[PDB]
């Protein structure tokens, strides 16, 4: 019954990594962006961030209860010791996973890649990202594979501020000719309130108060 503090934090990390994988495979076409585990004393509340928050809930919340019971039995929680919520992703344009999946379904249907990638770019920039980049790699038109980059705006690539300012995702499209790769990198703007983007300004950015 006694579990080390090391074994426990590794177990929480592995549980998070597995939950998100099964939700990514299950709530795929619901716009699943991410999951926020929150272990409260009574229950381990689990918040799901998605775009179709009526498709994950289901008819009278049947799907969400099915997922809540599957998580309880599979992960071995105490009964009523886990409750899966489902919130709304505030800004879908500023999420690279939401746009990666949107571009996935915009290509599974059959739309031309050069027209859906620029559409994703358009939506991201109207959403407010300081810069966005899309990469499409695979057998796009011919048998030889090539990589088409779709960059617009300002994008940093090196240093620590990358893992604060760059929201990125990597998704496959399972097409008839093979697998198509999608790398979406969205560069966020500095939000003083820390909602739309980082709260810490970029290190090189200097502001001089006017006299």
């Amino acid at each position: 019954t006694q579990i080390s503090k090391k074994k426990k934090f590794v177990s929480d990390g592995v549980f998070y990594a597995e939950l998100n994988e099964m939700l990514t495979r299950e709530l795929a076409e619901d716009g699943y962006s991410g999951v926020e585990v929150r272990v409260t004393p009574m229950r381990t509340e689990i918040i799901i961030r998605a775009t179709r928050t009526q498709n994950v809930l289901g008819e009278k919340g049947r799907r969400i209860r099915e997922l809540t019971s599957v998580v309880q039995k599979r992960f071995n929680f105490p009964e009523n010791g886990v409750e899966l919520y489902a919130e709304k992703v505030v800004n879908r344009g500023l999420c690279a996973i939401a746009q990666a999946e949107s571009l996935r379904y915009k290509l599974l249907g059959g739309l031309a890649v050069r027209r859906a990638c620029y559409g994703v770019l358009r939506f991201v920039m109207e959403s407010g990202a300081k810069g966005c980049e899309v990469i499409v790699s695979g057998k796009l038109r011919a048998q030889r594979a090539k990589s088409m980059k779709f960059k617009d705006g300002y994008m940093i690539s090196s240093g620590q501020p990358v893992n604060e300012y760059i929201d990125a995702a990597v998704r496959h499209v399972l097409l008839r000719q093979g697998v198509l790769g999608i790398k979406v990198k969205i560069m966020l703007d500095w939000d003083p309130k820390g909602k739309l983007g980082p709260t810490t300004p970029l290190p090189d950015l200097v502001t001089i108060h006017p006299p």
């Binding site: 503090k5 934090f9 929150r38």
Partner: protein, 103 residues
């Protein structure tokens, strides 16, 4: 009050853990309970080093992953009631609070 309470706090982040600890020691010092803490245990550094290549070709380059576990111990003298009344504020995610009653 009567008994001796050891609250162990663990986390993977320093700021959340420290602000939770500050909340606990502030609540303890408002209700006039003597508080010994926060006492910072040596940080545990969980390290994984693996070959970045998914195969055996190229320069054998190694990425070193680290998980840092930070442990805080707070020692009050009181009754269980005030202890669970204090450790009922919004404990931030990632912080593992653990209350143990001593003699």
């Amino acid at each position: 009050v009567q008994h001796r309470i050891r609250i162990t706090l663990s986390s993977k982040s320093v700021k959340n853990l420290e602000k939770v600890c500050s909340d606990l020691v502030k609540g303890a010092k408002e209700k006039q309970l003597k508080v010994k803490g926060p006492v910072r245990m040596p940080t545990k550094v969980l390290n994984i080093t693996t070959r970045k290549s998914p195969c055996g070709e190229g320069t054998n380059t190694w990425d070193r992953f680290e998980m840092r576990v930070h442990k805080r111990v707070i020692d009050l003298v009181s009754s269980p009631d005030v202890v669970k009344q204090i450790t009922s504020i919004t404990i931030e995610p990632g912080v593992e609070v653990e209350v143990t009653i001593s003699d």
